[PDB]
Design a protein around this ligand. Structure first.
Ligand SMILES: C[C@H](NC(=O)OCc1ccccc1)C(=O)NCP(=O)(O)O[C@@H](Cc1ccccc1)C(=O)O
Ligand SMILES: [Zn+2]
Length: 307
């Protein structure tokens, strides 16, 4: 580093290296990327979103967030490689270039900064935010149980010490509310992508009820395609389907909330692996994992642009 070109993508980085990488990239591509602060975390850290845009007014946008669960380190590293990928391929790749010429892409690499900081200094398997429940001494809320979609219903814990704790009311965590507000104010998101690990799954709604979304046929066919493009590189196999049906019942999840707000293409990716290394995926796996998951995400953006 000194430029994102000498930056090392095949290694895990700390919160400071990633935020400093963001400034390097914007500085290197000032007319394509900008850094927006959409909030501050519970402990007072800035929450950043990179906007990639080739111009326009309120262009149709794609939201992608990573690291809402802080111990899932393959997602922040994949986000860093994505962000680089976007500035390299815009101009050279024809379908990506055509997506960016008509749509804006919003990328949040570290959705949960306080827990990420905590996985480096004190506990590598921390999942939740770091908010302090005054009613309790256990710290933190599961941010993927805190959205207003089946909030507080089965599929989440109501105990503060649980690592699935939904929190006291929907959007109690400022890390969640900061996205909700940015995404209601813009008003023109067409796709909402949340990246997690692990298990090799591509999921769409719902997580809290077995009822079918009205557009199941389409999201299913889209998932089918993305999974096939992803598998093209290294043969990695992904399963896909609704959340409740494909990993387990979960309530208050973010993609059920964006899909209920009108954002039709709402999917969550569960990255490598399927359990052998789990959350502590070796660093040798970052690049093959980021390359193949990019082919799946590019498939969804392409469907979004034309349908
Ligand atoms: C809480 C859980 N504990 C855990 O120990 O999971 C182990 C496990 C691994 C793989 C398969 C099954 C189980 C966990 O961290 N799961 C990983 P996740 O954060 O990727 O799962 C998403 C699933 C999900 C996705 C979208 C909406 C709702 C739910 C989640 O629980 O938020
Ligand atoms: Zn997760």
């Amino acid at each position: 580093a000194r430029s994102t070109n000498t930056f090392n993508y095949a290694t895990y980085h700390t919160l400071d290296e990633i935020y400093d990488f963001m400034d390097l990239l914007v500085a290197q591509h000032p007319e394509l990327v900008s850094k927006l602060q959409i909030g501050r975390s519970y402990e007072g850290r800035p929450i950043y979103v990179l906007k990639f845009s080739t111009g326009g007014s309120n262009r149709p946008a794609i939201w992608i967030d990573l690291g809402i669960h802080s111990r899932e380190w393959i997602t922040q590293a994949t986000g860093v490689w994505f962000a680089k990928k976007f500035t390299e391929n815009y101009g050279q790749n024809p379908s990506f270039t055509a997506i960016l010429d008509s749509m804006d892409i919003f990328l949040e690499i570290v959705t949960n900064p306080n827990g990420f900081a905590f996985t480096h200094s004190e506990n590598r398997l921390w999942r939740k935010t770091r908010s302090v429940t005054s009613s309790s001494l256990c710290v933190g809320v599961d941010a993927n149980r805190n959205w207003d979609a089946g909030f507080g219903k089965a599929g989440a814990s109501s105990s503060p010490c649980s690592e699935t704790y939904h929190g006291k009311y929907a959007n109690s965590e400022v890390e969640v509310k900061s996205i909700v507000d940015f995404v209601k104010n813009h008003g023109n998101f067409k796709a909402f992508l949340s990246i997690h690990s692990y298990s090799q799954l591509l999921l769409y709604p719902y997580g809290y009820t077995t009822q079918s979304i009205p557009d199941k046929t389409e999201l299913n066919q889209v998932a089918k395609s993305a999974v096939a493009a992803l598998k093209s590189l290294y043969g990695t196999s992904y399963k896909y389907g609704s959340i409740i049906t494909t990993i387990y019942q979960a309530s208050g999840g973010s993609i059920d909330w964006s899909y209920n707000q009108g954002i039709k293409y709402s999917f969550t990716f569960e990255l490598r692996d399927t359990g052998r290394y789990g959350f502590l995926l070796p660093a040798s796996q970052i690049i093959p994992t980021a390359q193949e998951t990019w082919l799946g995400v590019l498939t969804i953006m392409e469907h979004t642009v034309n349908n």
